[PDB]
C-alpha cells in the first residue's frame, strides 16, 4: 500500500479474509460475502 488522506479503516472479522474500508455500511455489505452466496 501507500500513504494519503483518508478516514479510519474498519476491518473484516472473518478468518482468512484481508478486507478493509473506511465505511461501516461498505463493511456490512462485505460481511454478506461470507454469510451468503449466489
Known binding positions for Zn(2+): 12, 17, 30, 34
Closest CB to Zn ion among 1 and 3? 1
Residue with smaller CB distance to Zn ion, 2 or 31: 31
Whether 3 contacts 22, CB under 8 Å: no
Maximum C-alpha span of the chain: 35
The beta-strand segments (E) located in the chain are 10-11, 20-21
> Could you say whether residue 27 binds Zn ion (CB under 5 A)?
no
Q: Does 12 bind Zn ion (CB under 5 A)?
A: yes
Query: What are the residues binding Zn ion (CB under 5 A)?
Result: 12, 14, 17, 19
Amino acid at each position: 500500500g501507500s500513504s494519503g488522506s483518508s478516514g479510519i479503516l474498519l476491518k473484516c472479522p472473518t478468518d482468512g479474509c484481508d478486507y478493509s474500508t473506511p465505511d461501516k455500511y461498505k463493511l456490512q455489505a462485505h460481511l454478506k460475502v461470507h454469510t451468503a452466496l449466489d
